[PDB]
Design an enzyme around this catalytic site. Structure first.
Site, PDB file in Angstrom:
ATOM      1  N   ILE A 186      -2.542  -8.318 -12.516  1.00 43.66           N
ATOM      2  CA  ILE A 186      -3.204  -9.441 -13.437  1.00 43.66           C
ATOM      3  C   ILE A 186      -4.593  -9.269 -13.744  1.00 43.66           C
ATOM      4  CG2 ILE A 186      -1.437 -10.960 -12.535  1.00 43.66           C
ATOM      5  CD1 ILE A 186      -3.520 -12.422 -10.600  1.00 43.66           C
ATOM      6  N   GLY A 187      -4.913  -7.826 -13.112  1.00 42.47           N
ATOM      7  CA  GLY A 187      -6.522  -7.646 -13.384  1.00 42.47           C
ATOM      8  C   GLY A 187      -6.448  -6.058 -12.967  1.00 42.47           C
ATOM      9  N   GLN A 188      -7.684  -5.639 -13.774  1.00 45.16           N
ATOM     10  CA  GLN A 188      -7.984  -4.211 -12.917  1.00 45.16           C
ATOM     11  C   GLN A 188      -9.183  -3.639 -13.174  1.00 45.16           C
ATOM     12  OE1 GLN A 188      -5.146  -1.545 -15.523  1.00 45.16           O
ATOM     13  NE2 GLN A 188      -6.147   0.438 -14.847  1.00 45.16           N
ATOM     14  N   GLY A 242     -12.070  -3.830  -8.712  1.00 44.93           N
ATOM     15  CA  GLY A 242     -10.809  -3.383  -7.926  1.00 44.93           C
ATOM     16  C   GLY A 242      -9.641  -3.882  -8.989  1.00 44.93           C
ATOM     17  N   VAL A 265      -6.280  -6.404  -9.352  1.00 44.15           N
ATOM     18  CA  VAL A 265      -5.693  -7.678  -8.607  1.00 44.15           C
ATOM     19  C   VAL A 265      -4.452  -7.692  -8.977  1.00 44.15           C
ATOM     20  CG1 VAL A 265      -5.723 -10.088  -8.395  1.00 44.15           C
ATOM     21  CG2 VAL A 265      -8.092  -8.516  -8.696  1.00 44.15           C
ATOM     22  N   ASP A 304     -23.231 -17.144  -8.352  1.00 38.40           N
ATOM     23  CA  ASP A 304     -22.456 -16.882  -9.402  1.00 38.40           C
ATOM     24  C   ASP A 304     -21.607 -17.847  -9.712  1.00 38.40           C
ATOM     25  OD1 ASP A 304     -22.207 -15.343 -11.523  1.00 38.40           O
ATOM     26  OD2 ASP A 304     -20.880 -13.952 -10.539  1.00 38.40           O
TER      27      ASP A 304
HETATM   28  N1  LIG Z   1      -6.864 -16.015  -6.032  1.00 35.58           N
HETATM   29  C1  LIG Z   1      -6.418 -15.736  -7.104  1.00 35.58           C
HETATM   30  N2  LIG Z   1      -5.362 -16.479  -7.765  1.00 35.58           N
HETATM   31  C2  LIG Z   1      -4.826 -16.496  -9.005  1.00 35.58           C
HETATM   32  N3  LIG Z   1      -5.507 -15.578  -9.879  1.00 35.58           N
HETATM   33  C3  LIG Z   1      -6.582 -14.749  -9.368  1.00 35.58           C
HETATM   34  C4  LIG Z   1      -6.765 -15.036  -7.923  1.00 35.58           C
HETATM   35  N4  LIG Z   1      -7.938 -14.192  -7.918  1.00 35.58           N
HETATM   36  C5  LIG Z   1      -8.390 -13.644  -9.210  1.00 35.58           C
HETATM   37  N5  LIG Z   1      -7.667 -13.936 -10.075  1.00 35.58           N
HETATM   38  C6  LIG Z   1      -7.402 -13.744 -11.501  1.00 35.58           C
HETATM   39  O1  LIG Z   1      -7.255 -12.247 -11.554  1.00 35.58           O
HETATM   40  C7  LIG Z   1      -8.017 -11.607 -12.901  1.00 35.58           C
HETATM   41  C8  LIG Z   1      -8.891 -10.527 -12.304  1.00 35.58           C
HETATM   42  O2  LIG Z   1      -9.970 -10.905 -11.398  1.00 35.58           O
HETATM   43  P1  LIG Z   1     -11.361 -10.367 -11.022  1.00 35.58           P
HETATM   44  O3  LIG Z   1     -11.480 -10.123  -9.853  1.00 35.58           O
HETATM   45  O4  LIG Z   1     -11.367  -8.955 -12.178  1.00 35.58           O
HETATM   46  O5  LIG Z   1     -12.443 -11.307 -11.669  1.00 35.58           O
HETATM   47  P2  LIG Z   1     -12.709 -11.620 -13.106  1.00 35.58           P
HETATM   48  O6  LIG Z   1     -12.842 -12.948 -13.325  1.00 35.58           O
HETATM   49  O7  LIG Z   1     -12.173 -10.640 -13.869  1.00 35.58           O
HETATM   50  O8  LIG Z   1     -14.551 -10.921 -12.917  1.00 35.58           O
HETATM   51  P3  LIG Z   1     -14.844  -9.704 -13.411  1.00 35.58           P
HETATM   52  O9  LIG Z   1     -16.079 -10.279 -14.575  1.00 35.58           O
HETATM   53  O10 LIG Z   1     -15.572  -8.759 -12.342  1.00 35.58           O
HETATM   54  O11 LIG Z   1     -13.801  -8.879 -14.158  1.00 35.58           O
HETATM   55  C9  LIG Z   1      -8.826 -12.632 -13.409  1.00 35.58           C
HETATM   56  O12 LIG Z   1      -8.084 -13.202 -14.384  1.00 35.58           O
HETATM   57  C10 LIG Z   1      -8.603 -13.944 -12.172  1.00 35.58           C
HETATM   58  O13 LIG Z   1      -8.625 -15.134 -12.638  1.00 35.58           O
END
Ligand SMILES: Nc1ncnc2c1ncn2[C@@H]1O[C@H](COP(=O)(O)OP(=O)(O)OP(=O)(O)O)[C@@H](O)[C@H]1O
Ligand SMILES: [Mg+2]
Ligand SMILES: [Mg+2]
Length: 292
Positions: A27-29, A33, A35, A140
């Site tokens: 759901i993230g890359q 890291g 996710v 933040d």
């Molecule tokens: N505990 C969680 N439950 C559901 N979704 C999550 C959780 N933690 C992170 N996410 C989602 O996963 C995705 C990747 O999160 P990431 O850690 O990259 O934060 P980010 O909001 O993308 O910050 P960055 O600016 O560092 O990319 C985002 O869409 C975030 O909302």
């Protein structure tokens, strides 16, 4: 780094989480890291797992700080840190999964009413009062770090930038925030305190009203100059807002730090008492999720 890795080893649970979780969905890359969403094989609980390659990670001590802060500052308005694992160079951090997406999804895709905004501000303020009383500044605060449950639960995430202060050393200097949500003193003064989180909340309230923080379309350096010199941001249609909401905004967005409300003070504010039940957010959350 031998030291840091050993410190990490003492913090994490032993063994390989690969056995313990199933059906990974990315759901993230990016950057912080990868996710994944996944299922706890035992409990059935759905979780979110961040995987980090440590040799790629520039500042490991911040990740250590993040985990320790999460472990010892549990709160209903903070995304629950469940567990962590270290497999060679691969650090896993397991969080509870919030299936409601983020506040950013909501504020960009739907239109919140004042009762709904008061509920969200209240929950955020509960997390901040708790954190600030435990000597933690988040640093933040922004809608992206506010995650939602399908039931309207509001929870703070992303402790990678937090500061652990003291009654002795209330002030910090490191630049860690996101420019549009940054309090003026972050750039106009040598140091700042916990009330930078209150200012950031103010800007989030503006996001909920108008869909974006002030100056969003400006380059972040131009924005920072505007924040530093303009001070209390201006609103599009101030007269459309209730008097109590306008007052709440003004307390959050005071230029004079001493005058700006603390979390403990703002918790008492009458704007929050117009809060709808959190469940009222469910339809917006559902619409945002779909549109997203
Ligand atoms: N505990 C969680 N439950 C559901 N979704 C999550 C959780 N933690 C992170 N996410 C989602 O996963 C995705 C990747 O999160 P990431 O850690 O990259 O934060 P980010 O909001 O993308 O910050 P960055 O600016 O560092 O990319 C985002 O869409 C975030 O909302
Ligand atoms: Mg983020
Ligand atoms: Mg994040």
């Amino acid at each position: 780094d031998e030291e840091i890795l050993e410190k990490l080893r003492s913090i994490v649970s032993v063994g390989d989480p690969k056995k313990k979780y199933t059906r990974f969905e990315k759901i993230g890359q990016g950057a912080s890291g990868t996710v994944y969403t996944a299922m706890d094989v035992a409990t059935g609980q759905e979780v979110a797992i961040r995987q980090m390659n440590l040799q790629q990670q520039p500042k490991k001590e911040l990740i250590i700080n993040e985990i320790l802060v999460m472990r010892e500052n549990k709160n209903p308005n903070i995304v629950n840190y469940l567990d962590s694992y270290l497999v060679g160079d691969e650090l896993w951090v397991v969080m509870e999964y919030l299936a409601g997406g983020s506040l950013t999804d909501v504020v960009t895709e739907t239109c919140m009413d004042e009762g709904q905004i008061a509920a969200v501000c209240r929950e955020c303020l509960q997390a901040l009062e708790f954190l600030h009383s435990n000597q933690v500044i988040h640093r933040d605060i922004k809608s992206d770090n506010i995650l939602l449950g399908m039931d309207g639960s509001v929870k703070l995430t992303d402790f990678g930038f937090c500061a652990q202060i003291t009654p002795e050393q209330s002030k910090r200097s490191t630049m860690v925030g996101t420019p549009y949500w940054m309090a003026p003193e972050v750039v106009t003064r040598k140091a700042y305190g916990p009330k930078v989180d209150i200012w950031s909340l103010g800007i989030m309230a503006i996001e909920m009203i108008e869909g974006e923080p002030p100056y969003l379309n400006e380059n972040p350096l131009r924005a920072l100059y505007l924040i530093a010199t303009n001070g209390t941001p201006e609103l599009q249609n101030p007269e459309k807002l209730s008097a109590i909401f306008r007052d709440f905004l003004n307390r959050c967005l005071e230029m004079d730090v001493e005058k700006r409300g603390s979390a403990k003070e703002l918790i008492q504010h009458q704007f929050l008492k117009i809060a709808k039940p959190l469940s009222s957010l469910t339809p917006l959350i559902a619409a945002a999720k779909e549109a997203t």
